[PDB]
Design a protein around this ligand. Structure first.
Ligand code: HEM
Ligand code: HEM
Ligand code: HEM
Ligand code: HEM
Ligand code: HEM
Ligand code: HEM
Ligand code: HEM
Ligand code: HEM
Ligand code: HEM
Ligand code: HEM
Ligand code: HEM
Ligand code: HEM
Ligand SMILES: [C-]#N
Ligand SMILES: [C-]#N
Ligand SMILES: [C-]#N
Ligand SMILES: [C-]#N
Ligand SMILES: [C-]#N
Ligand SMILES: [C-]#N
Lengths: 127, 126, 127, 126, 127, 127, 127, 127, 126, 126, 127, 127
């Protein structure tokens, strides 16, 4: 279709990204100890639902979670440039794992531009 | 041989669920409850769920994860009235399938399942 | 202008109501099992913040928790008429413990009418 | 006026549940699922629950604690067959109450609840 | 004659089936959400012990856990055809991983017949 | 037949005993440290159900929990004479709180003889 | 005499400071974008209660608001260096309006050192 | 009585102080949110053991816990003047509950002086 | 009647444990493991524990809390050697009590208990 | 170098444990506590544990998992009577092993251990 | 270069040993049941920290945790010869994975000699 | 280049800054009392790695040190306003030792703003 979500391959693509992302998080010395060790599956699910929604996919995230209120969702954690950069490192790996046939050069840039902006907007701590 | 295969698999479930969701679209009661405009996503997810439920492809759980139907319906006020409207549309959809595709035994099992599941999802007094 | 909140004695009144409500809950065969055993302090605080906001007091609740989304916040719990009635019993006890000088008949009635309707609107289970 | 008082309260619920459980005793399907002999305790617990549910005395939760119906039914295999037999018996018991006592709207409300609750408690394929 | 347990290679075989089953579970989007994430080792062991006993091996299971009472042990979980099918998928691959020298065609048949019947018997939910 | 259960006032009596016992348990320097502190309500309920069943009341305990297997259910805890004595002190207080019209002298003596014997039977540790 | 609160003039002084502070906030281009849009009366009350309690005066703050969680209560708002500085300007203005007889050199310096450290510590945003 | 501990009545006195102190904590708006709600028995016990040891009594505290290292022990907690003042308020109440024959004016003063100083030494946060 | 009362109550326990801890002070193996000087506190706590264990006053748990003997012995290296020295001191202390106070059956019961308890507290290979 | 190898390894532990469990089968006290008939699995598991404990093969943990002996003995009432019967039978078994295979130092070390462990496993006043 | 820590490659080497140790622990049937499943990252971190300090590197361990007090750290666990042997197997594998260029034959002997003596010193249980 | 780290000269710049910083600490009357007593070599290395990572350089800090827990890591040390100011003096001196060609006015301002905020936020002591 027309939606960014469908253009990039819909649910299959977002599951692939968020899934490979959280696998990176597991091996990430920084983020390993940020994400609640006991709730890894649920965390992945919420991030996927959110990104699906954001890019014009299902609006399930909002029905389940409310307005994103990301600032307040991340308030429990001390996110400095170090966490921001680790998150982006993991996400860049995840996104780079998607072939160019599925994910355009134009769609890739748009996505990465958003992620880069969003991650910085959520920094809430000097260390 | 799975139920899914026995009843004609993908074509049958697409026929049922597309006919069901075409009805929802024109149903006063249900239009009020389903998200406001394009029911394309709702149709896809329902179809995928039923296909996996009856032994077909596992693409529902692949795309939506472990089923948590009560929680997924929780945002919506499903009273007896919505339940009955849903069941009417679904009975209509199933009735559109011929006896050669969906034999009497499989028809009864499918309908028995859907009625009880629909009752089990009622989550609101109004 | 005079707010319902100030008219009824503000923070002090709402703290009396909610604390006494939560003390009744602990004593209630139905409800003591519903409220998470390990988070009664926070639970009490969130209800208090919500009610203070609803009735014209501080708007901290919305800042901290977003839109009330009460249906989704109660979704984790099977609330039938039995839990609704037990909730109203406890709340009625709590409200009755406020004197009439503080909470006059008119404001008492308005409060109780709201709580009755709100409790009825949160029923989400047959049993 | 609670629903409980409107329909005649304890007198009515004892009449409904007495007549219900008298049928259970002779229903081969249900006789097999209920504990093997004296159905007095099962009758008393179902009656107490219904009385509390509809706004009467709190004896049920005082004696039984917070309602946990799915878990309390979990030891028993309640398939569609048991559900239907339970419902048949309940309808038959409710039909014994006159219209002066249980008017049309209340009768409908009660039956609607019981049908929905029974579907919601099915917990076995056979 | 020989026990079923000894005939198929006893503890080593049952350990292999159940550990491979449990690794499949972790990679199963349906089932990884159903098994308590904090208790996977203990859950594996209990299944292992049950199976060893059922097939004529050590009766430690009964000593430690009492009668199987599998219906009540599974009551805490909503097991529909979806979870039943996912369980059978994971178990089928685990069993398939045992070679024919260890696990006869006749024995393999008998084991699988039982697991398929038992998994179906434990469905307790419409969804 | 007349059950001991009915003779001593049935569900109401057993609820009063077990509820008062557990309130003693909370003020007990020995026992408050033995009972998992996040599970006191479920603990109270299971003991109530067992005691109702033992004395000829509802057989719900057996349905929900199987055979009592009290030895194996207390195996997780180090029960020495110190814990036995503390348990009995609290239970004696709880039983003493029931009036003589509800619980007459001979039923009281029978109930207490059983509890004393049962408490001693669950001793599993030297300290 | 004894407490910092009494030494500096108590309720009188803190009302003078915070009222003058929050009258500054109302006209402040930076801060009016961050404080909740209209009536700053509740904001002033809460800040004043907090400061009064912090310095050893009445415990009204915690009685009405609970245990201080300043980071979380500020988390809804974007407090960058710009807002921190703006807040400190208003506060320095407010403190400078108190004469030396009421707030002597020693207490003035102590107060301002604290406010400086506190404000810096509440920065939670890059922009 | 030659040791401070013995002079003031030993174990009985210290149990009474710390017991009553912890009861005050539970009623304290500031402090009940600071002490982990699932570990109150243990926390009371550790403080008792520490205080017994500090004042010339049993040296069990250091056997069990090592060197006090109170600063590091309190590092997980934001202790500002507000928490310091509330702790001291609860402790003054506890100490005041002991008669003067048991704890005479001279020992009371030494104990209070120490507790005031120690609470101040543990402040680690601006709010 | 409690074991505690049967053996003469406080006087007997004070006699046993005082004589026990007087031995400890001169036992080179035990002197090395008990904290370095005044064993008055250790003696008090052991006595209170044993008095409560055998049905006497609850002073032990009142002052010390719920018993956690393994954790309380954990700071100390109790090998077979320390276990045997402790047992010998206790045997010697118990032998100081006459048969009129501590009859043959209660003596055996006490000794059997101490032996079991002492073995269960060994926590070191050296 | 391993205690297991020093005492003659598999042959020795099979010798000790087989003769031990032969005694068990004929022991009134023990016969009552071990599972009612074929002591074959019990013998196997004890042997494997002792073998692993003393530095031999890891077959025990491979087949049985992390050791949890207290919990594994919990189902059985092991009073001092059962402890003493077990120890007698074990001492008999060990005494059937000659000094050249099990020298005086390894014998004492083995017996010290078995005594301590058996004492630590008493879990019942009767 | 000078300290043992530098001689063997410092932080890099110790991270490799401990990390590889903890991977072996996860596949050890004895030890995976001993280490708290919910705290593996922290466990590895604390062991790394301790070893780094012990061999003359950073003294962060003592700053954060105090004197090692390893007997008391291990008291919560039943460490018999079986656990001792499993630990040493895992650690020997981890150490053996370090090349002889990084870890001298003389430094390897010294490291392993310490580890073998320490593991034995921490045995605290018969089974 | 594009990362802050690269734009300001990367490894060379950070080594120069932190080398010059820690050379001062050694002879600083205030700071020498707070840093571990002798060889400030490890401290310097650790601070450098941290700042390099923080500004988008190598991840060597998290690789060797884990996730930043700066508050906890400074917890052992009494950092009042005096130590804060002494630290900032030494750091401002080190930063001033870098020429404008290497370290932009723009980048210098950003770096200094961060260091001031970070340092203020790490104050953990009244004295
Ligand atoms: C900047 C570094 C970030 C870190 C360290 C981080 C970390 C976390 C953590 C620890 C959680 C809680 C996990 C859970 O329990 O759900 C979370 C939640 C979440 N994050 Fe992030 N995150 C970062 C950035 C982002 C970004 C850039 C996005 C979107 C573009 C995002 C979207 C979400 C969503 C949608 C949730 C779930 C919110 C909910 O509960 O509904 N995060 N994040
Ligand atoms: C009782 C009457 C029912 C009503 C009024 C109802 C209504 C809805 C609505 C409004 C949604 C959200 C649609 C969207 O995504 O925009 C939904 C989702 C869904 N429904 Fe129903 N539904 C009913 C019964 C059922 C039954 C009986 C089933 C299957 C047995 C079912 C299966 C599903 C599934 C699989 C989803 C998607 C869940 C997810 O993956 O997020 N529903 N339903
Ligand atoms: C009908 C019976 C009700 C039951 C059984 C019930 C029970 C609960 C429970 C168990 C929670 C979770 C406690 C927590 O952790 O926060 C909760 C949350 C809450 N409830 Fe209720 N409740 C009922 C009705 C109401 C009503 C009538 C109101 C308002 C008038 C209300 C307002 C709230 C609020 C504001 C929260 C916190 C939501 C948040 O997280 O922000 N509840 N309730
Ligand atoms: C679906 C068909 C049903 C069947 C076959 C069934 C059967 C049973 C059985 C066998 C028991 C245990 C009886 C005993 O104590 O010996 C029971 C308990 C109970 N049932 Fe049902 N039941 C059904 C539906 C319902 C419904 C619809 C309700 C209420 C709306 C209900 C309410 C209860 C209550 C309150 C108990 C006692 C729970 C307790 O306090 O332990 N049942 N049922
Ligand atoms: C139908 C799909 C099934 C699902 C989703 C499922 C899931 C579960 C879960 C979540 C548990 C609790 C894990 C724990 O011990 O903490 C469990 C326990 C257990 N399951 Fe299943 N299971 C299924 C089928 C089966 C089958 C077919 C068998 C036997 C052939 C079985 C045997 C057991 C046993 C023996 C336990 C441990 C009971 C105890 O606590 O003693 N399960 N299962
Ligand atoms: C001798 C001292 C005793 C102690 C220290 C003790 C303690 C405990 C504890 C800690 C639990 C587990 C609570 C939980 O986490 O669920 C428990 C369970 C239970 N206890 Fe006791 N108990 C004692 C004696 C008794 C006696 C004498 C009886 C019967 C007269 C009894 C009956 C039960 C029952 C029925 C359960 C629930 C088992 C289940 O899970 O179904 N206990 N006890
Ligand atoms: C750094 C610059 C600061 C800014 C921009 C700021 C801004 C705000 C805002 C917008 C609110 C919510 C206002 C409302 O209720 O409508 C608030 C609340 C509050 N602030 Fe600040 N603040 C700052 C620093 C401080 C400092 C330094 C303190 C005390 C030392 C402080 C103490 C408080 C308190 C006690 C509350 C009320 C918390 C509650 O009970 O809900 N703030 N602040
Ligand atoms: C200044 C206000 C204080 C606050 C808010 C406070 C709070 C706390 C909290 C929350 C804990 C952890 C509870 C636990 O799990 O053990 C704790 C531990 C402890 N506190 Fe305090 N405390 C304060 C002052 C003091 C003072 C003045 C002393 C000594 C006179 C003290 C002695 C201790 C000891 C010995 C522990 C246990 C350390 C251990 O784990 O061994 N505290 N405190
Ligand atoms: C096995 C040989 C034993 C040795 C070497 C030993 C040694 C010790 C030592 C060194 C202490 C600390 C003394 C102090 O306060 O300075 C202690 C405490 C104690 N011991 Fe033993 N002990 C042994 C066996 C036993 C036995 C068999 C019992 C009781 C049956 C026992 C009961 C106690 C009690 C109640 C305490 C005080 C615990 C507390 O409240 O902190 N001990 N022991
Ligand atoms: C104190 C007297 C003892 C008695 C009466 C006793 C009795 C028993 C019994 C009845 C069983 C279950 C047998 C079966 O599987 O059918 C058992 C299991 C076992 N016993 Fe003992 N035992 C004693 C002491 C010991 C000692 C001292 C050890 C080792 C030092 C030991 C090691 C084991 C082991 C390893 C098992 C198998 C545990 C498992 O893997 O499931 N026992 N014992
Ligand atoms: C003998 C076999 C051993 C076993 C079974 C064992 C097991 C454990 C376990 C389960 C923990 C708790 C993990 C945690 O921190 O959550 C732990 C902690 C620890 N162990 Fe071991 N360990 C053994 C030997 C050793 C040895 C030989 C050393 C030193 C060379 C050591 C050093 C440590 C340290 C430093 C900690 C963390 C202490 C702290 O909390 O600060 N362990 N061990
Ligand atoms: C406020 C004034 C400060 C003082 C007095 C101070 C002092 C110290 C001291 C004494 C240490 C331990 C040194 C050692 O390992 O021997 C340390 C560690 C450290 N500091 Fe600071 N510091 C201050 C501010 C800062 C700031 C602003 C930063 C970064 C923006 C910082 C970053 C670090 C790092 C990364 C460590 C090592 C943490 C670790 O990996 O263990 N410090 N500091
Ligand atoms: C549902 N649709
Ligand atoms: C159900 N009766
Ligand atoms: C903040 N005011
Ligand atoms: C212990 N003495
Ligand atoms: C054990 N034998
Ligand atoms: C800190 N440096």
């Amino acid at each position: 279709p027309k939606s960014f979500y469908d253009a990039v391959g819909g649910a299959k693509t977002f599951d692939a990204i968020v899934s490979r992302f959280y696998a990176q998080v597991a091996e990430d010395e920084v983020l390993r100890r940020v994400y609640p060790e006991d709730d890894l599956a649920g965390a992945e699910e919420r991030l996927r639902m959110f990104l699906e929604q954001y890019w014009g996919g299902p609006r399930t995230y909002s029905e389940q979670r409310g307005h994103p209120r990301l600032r307040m969702r991340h308030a429990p954690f001390r996110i400095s440039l170090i966490e921001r950069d680790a998150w982006l490192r993991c996400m860049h790996t995840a996104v780079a794992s998607i072939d160019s046939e599925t994910l355009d050069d134009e769609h890739r840039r748009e996505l990465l531009d958003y992620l880069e902006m969003a991650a910085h907007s959520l920094v809430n701590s000097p260390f």
